[PDB]
Amino acid sequence: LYKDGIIQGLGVEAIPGAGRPANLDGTLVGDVGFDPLGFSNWLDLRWAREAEIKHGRVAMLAATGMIVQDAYKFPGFEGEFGGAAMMKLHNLAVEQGAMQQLLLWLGLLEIISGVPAIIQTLNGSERQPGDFGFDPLNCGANPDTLARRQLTELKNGRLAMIAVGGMVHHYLLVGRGPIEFITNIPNFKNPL
Amino acid sequence: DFSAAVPFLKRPSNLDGTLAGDVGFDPLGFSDVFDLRVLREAELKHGRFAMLAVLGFLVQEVYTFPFFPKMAPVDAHDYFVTQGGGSQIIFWISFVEIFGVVALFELIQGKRDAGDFAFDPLGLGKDEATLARYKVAEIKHARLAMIAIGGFIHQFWVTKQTVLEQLGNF
Amino acid sequence: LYGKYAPEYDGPTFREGLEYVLSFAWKPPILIAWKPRADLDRAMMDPAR
Numbered sequence: 001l002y003k004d005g006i007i008q009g010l011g012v013e014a015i016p017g018a019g020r021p022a023n024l025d026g027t028l029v030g031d032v033g034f035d036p037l038g039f040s041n042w043l044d045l046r047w048a049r050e051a052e053i054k055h056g057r058v059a060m061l062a063a064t065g066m067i068v069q070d071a072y073k074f075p076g077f078e079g080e081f082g083g084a085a086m087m088k089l090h091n092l093a094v095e096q097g098a099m100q101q102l103l104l105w106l107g108l109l110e111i112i113s114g115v116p117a118i119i120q121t122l123n124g125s126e127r128q129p130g131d132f133g134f135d136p137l138n139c140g141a142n143p144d145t146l147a148r149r150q151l152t153e154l155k156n157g158r159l160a161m162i163a164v165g166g167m168v169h170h171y172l173l174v175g176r177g178p179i180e181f182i183t184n185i186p187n188f189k190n191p192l
Numbered sequence: 193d194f195s196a197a198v199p200f201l202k203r204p205s206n207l208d209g210t211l212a213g214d215v216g217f218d219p220l221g222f223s224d225v226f227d228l229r230v231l232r233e234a235e236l237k238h239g240r241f242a243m244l245a246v247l248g249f250l251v252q253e254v255y256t257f258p259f260f261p262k263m264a265p266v267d268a269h270d271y272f273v274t275q276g277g278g279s280q281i282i283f284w285i286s287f288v289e290i291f292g293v294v295a296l297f298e299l300i301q302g303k304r305d306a307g308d309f310a311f312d313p314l315g316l317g318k319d320e321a322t323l324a325r326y327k328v329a330e331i332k333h334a335r336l337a338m339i340a341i342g343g344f345i346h347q348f349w350v351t352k353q354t355v356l357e358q359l360g361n362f
Numbered sequence: 363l364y365g366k367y368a369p370e371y372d373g374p375t376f377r378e379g380l381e382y383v384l385s386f387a388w389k390p391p392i393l394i395a396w397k398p399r400a401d402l403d404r405a406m407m408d409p410a411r
């Protein structure tokens with residue numbers, strides 16, 4: 001574990017002075033020992049991290065998503081969707097079917113890849129939770145490069161999930177898309 | 193241990209690797225639930241249907257028989273369900289499929305190989321090595337034609353353009 | 363072979379035979395192919411697979 005006992009691991013404690021959960025020992029990556037509401041006892045940390053990792057992945061795609069969709073609309077998509085972003089885009093996309101095709105293909109991936117893998121992991125398998133083998137670029141040969149990498153995938157991905165939320169919530173109460181939102185800092189001058 | 197086709201998934205047990213075109217691809221795992229020989233026969237039969245269908249789709253577009261009127265492939269089924277021919281074709285397919293049932297009963301008792309009917313009328317793949325390569329080529333081409341026939345027909349519905357036409361003008 | 367051949371017969375009765383032929387529609391051999399994997403269905407299917 002990258003920097004075990006330093007950045008992750010037993011010695012660390014997010015809520016120090018509070019005991020590290022009973023089921024939160026060292027091996028799981030991204031374990032600073034933070035399960036305040038004690039889900040660890042009731043949940044399968046396996047499913048848990050399948051979820052965390054999966055979420056963080058779809059959340060990164062999604063965050064970058066929104067940020068880029070506000071700089072460069074693909075022109076064909078742009079013309080069909082009329083410069084509509086985030087919430088409404090989903091509504092209009094869901095019409096052109098863009099969002100319908102995406103649903104079919106991601107669900108097919110899930111039924112082919114996701115569902116079966118989880119079933120195996122929970123039964124018990126060599127595969128780690130979230131361990132699809134996907135690196136065409138086998139970018140990290142080293143186990144060590146890869147530990148730093150897993151920690152970074154979890155954490156970059158958590159900023160991801162917190163921010164996709166911010167993006168969306170801000171968009172509901174204030175009109176602007178995320179690139180737009182920072183500009184026009186106050187955002188209450190115009191509900192846009 | 194782990195299927196080469198799906199590395200994160202484990203190798204499906206019944207798919208040892210003896211059958212042609214077996215890359216351990218069975219994510220949902222039907223082989224574990226049913227006889228692999230029956231599934232192999234279904235694969236070969238559907239795929240042979242699809243290979244013939246994919247060829248005929250194009251051969252009809254380039255050339256429709258003069259005694260019959262000229263209709264795009266999909267528009268023809270509705271024509272011949274009345275012309276009469278449709279019945280003749282589906283009739284003969286049923287006739288051959290009754291002996292297909294008999295062959296399936298042989299298959300259940302292990303007296304016949306899956307997707308095998310001793311059809312090498314011209315002794316093409318009579319070499320052991322070749323029959324293997326041909327068996328691999330047959331299963332791939334079948335697996336491809338399964339996709340191709342569906343595309344051809346579904347494209348016609350969404351776009352009234354016999355494939356050759358559509359490809360010509362998108 | 364053997365020119366005229368008469369094959370002695372001691373099998374099922376004629377009534378039983380026509381009942382077998384009736385069995386083609388009453389219980390054909392088609393769907394039994396799709397019964398589950400009959401050796402052991404992987405009763406010891408390893409949890410990993």
Ligand SMILES: CC1=C(C#C/C(C)=C/C=C/C(C)=C/C=C/C=C(C)/C=C/C=C(\C)C#CC2=C(C)C[C@@H](O)CC2(C)C)C(C)(C)C[C@H](O)C1
Nearest residue numbers: 054057058061062075076077078080102106107109110114
């Ligand atoms: C991380 C992760 C996951 C995931 C995920 C996610 C979130 C994935 C997101 C994927 C994305 C955003 C995919 C976008 C694809 C877009 C395509 C192919 C566009 C096609 C456009 C066409 C054909 C067009 C057009 C046009 C036409 C016809 C008409 C013209 O007038 C207009 C126009 C030119 C526009 C899952 C959930 C599976 C879990 C897994 O654990 C891993």
Ligand SMILES: CC1=C(C#C/C(C)=C/C=C/C(C)=C/C=C/C=C(C)/C=C/C=C(\C)C#CC2=C(C)C[C@@H](O)CC2(C)C)C(C)(C)C[C@H](O)C1
Nearest residue numbers: 060061063064135136137138139156163166167178181182
């Ligand atoms: C795995 C793998 C590979 C790979 C790969 C891939 C596909 C990698 C993809 C990585 C991605 C998509 C990463 C995205 C991270 C996004 C984050 C952290 C977002 C943060 C948002 C924040 C802080 C915010 C915000 C905001 C909010 C809320 C409101 C806004 O108004 C303002 C603001 C914008 C500030 C490859 C093949 C290359 C190699 C390897 O062989 C295998």
Ligand SMILES: CC1=C(C#C/C(C)=C/C=C/C(C)=C/C=C/C=C(C)/C=C/C=C(\C)C#CC2=C(C)C[C@@H](O)CC2(C)C)C(C)(C)C[C@H](O)C1
Nearest residue numbers: 218219220221238241242245248265266268269338339341
């Ligand atoms: C993901 C997944 C899997 C899978 C899978 C997949 C992708 C399965 C796909 C299956 C497909 C695509 C099957 C297609 C069959 C097509 C046939 C029989 C066509 C017949 C045409 C005829 C008779 C005709 C005709 C005609 C013609 C040509 C001429 C016209 O004038 C007339 C007419 C219209 C009548 C596996 C296997 C691993 C399992 C796993 O757990 C999950």
Ligand SMILES: CC1=C(C#C/C(C)=C/C=C/C(C)=C/C=C/C=C(C)/C=C/C=C(\C)C#CC2=C(C)C[C@@H](O)CC2(C)C)C(C)(C)C[C@H](O)C1
Nearest residue numbers: 243244246247311312313314315316333336337340343344
């Ligand atoms: C003679 C003989 C024998 C025999 C035999 C026979 C009769 C053999 C017949 C074999 C045939 C007809 C095989 C056909 C294969 C077709 C394929 C793979 C097509 C793929 C198309 C694709 C992917 C596509 C597409 C497309 C789509 C979907 C959409 C389009 O917009 C675009 C595009 C066009 C690109 C046997 C072996 C039985 C034994 C005997 O001893 C000797």
Ligand SMILES: CC1=C(C#C/C(C)=C/C=C/C(C)=C/C=C/C=C(C)/C=C/C=C(C)/C=C/C2=C(C)CCCC2(C)C)C(C)(C)C[C@H](O)C1
Nearest residue numbers: 014034086087088090091161162163164165166168169172
């Ligand atoms: C597409 C679509 C829609 C939609 C939508 C979407 C995309 C909705 C997305 C919603 C999401 C991603 C919500 C996230 C909320 C996150 C929160 C509150 C996190 C709080 C974290 C905290 C307090 C952390 C605190 C902490 C901190 C900082 C320090 C450490 C301790 C810790 C406790 C961890 C609709 C609904 C508009 C409908 C439309 O027709 C179609």
Ligand SMILES: CC1=C(C#C/C(C)=C/C=C/C(C)=C/C=C/C=C(C)/C=C/C=C(C)/C=C/C2=C(C)CCCC2(C)C)C(C)(C)C[C@H](O)C1
Nearest residue numbers: 108112242265266267269270338339340341342343345346
């Ligand atoms: C209705 C009707 C008729 C009819 C009819 C007929 C003849 C209908 C025939 C329909 C067919 C053959 C449809 C095939 C669909 C195939 C699909 C979706 C495959 C997807 C594969 C994928 C995504 C593969 C994915 C993949 C996998 C798993 C592994 C590798 C990676 C990857 C490639 C990504 C008529 C014309 C007779 C008229 C009549 O009145 C009634």
